Amino acid sequence: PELLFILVAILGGLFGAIVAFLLALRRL
Protein backbone atom coordinates (compact mmCIF):
# COMPACT_ATOMS: atom_id res chain seq x y z
CA PRO A 1 0.00 0.00 0.00
CA GLU A 2 3.05 2.26 0.21
CA LEU A 3 3.47 2.80 -3.54
CA LEU A 4 -0.25 3.46 -4.03
CA PHE A 5 -0.26 6.24 -1.42
CA ILE A 6 2.73 7.77 -3.23
CA LEU A 7 0.72 8.04 -6.45
CA VAL A 8 -2.06 9.64 -4.41
CA ALA A 9 0.44 12.21 -3.17
CA ILE A 10 1.86 12.61 -6.69
CA LEU A 11 -1.64 12.96 -8.16
CA GLY A 12 -2.46 15.53 -5.48
CA GLY A 13 0.62 17.54 -6.39
CA LEU A 14 -0.34 17.31 -10.05
CA PHE A 15 -3.77 18.64 -9.07
CA GLY A 16 -2.38 21.45 -6.91
CA ALA A 17 -0.03 22.67 -9.63
CA ILE A 18 -2.93 22.93 -12.09
CA VAL A 19 -4.96 24.80 -9.47
CA ALA A 20 -2.08 27.26 -9.18
CA PHE A 21 -2.22 27.70 -12.96
CA LEU A 22 -6.00 28.18 -13.02
CA LEU A 23 -5.82 30.77 -10.24
CA ALA A 24 -3.17 32.58 -12.29
CA LEU A 25 -5.39 32.59 -15.38
CA ARG A 26 -8.27 33.86 -13.23
CA ARG A 27 -6.15 36.95 -12.57
CA LEU A 28 -5.23 37.25 -16.26
Ligand X SMILES: CCCCCCCC/C=C/CCCCCCCC(=O)OC[C@@H](O)CO
Q: Which spans of this chain sit near ligand X (rule: CB under 6 A)?
A: 17-18, 20-21, 24
Q: Supply the minimum distance, in Å, between the C-beta of residue 4 and its own copies.
A: 7
Element (H, E) at 7: helix 2-27
Residue 28 is a binding residue for its own copies (CB under 8 A)? no
End-to-end CA distance of the chain: 41
Instruction: Compare residues 6 and 16 and give the one whose CB is closer to ligand X.
Output: 16
Contacts of 26 (CB under 8 A, 6+ apart): none
Name the binder of 3 from ligand X, its own copies, none, CB < 5-8 A by kind.
none
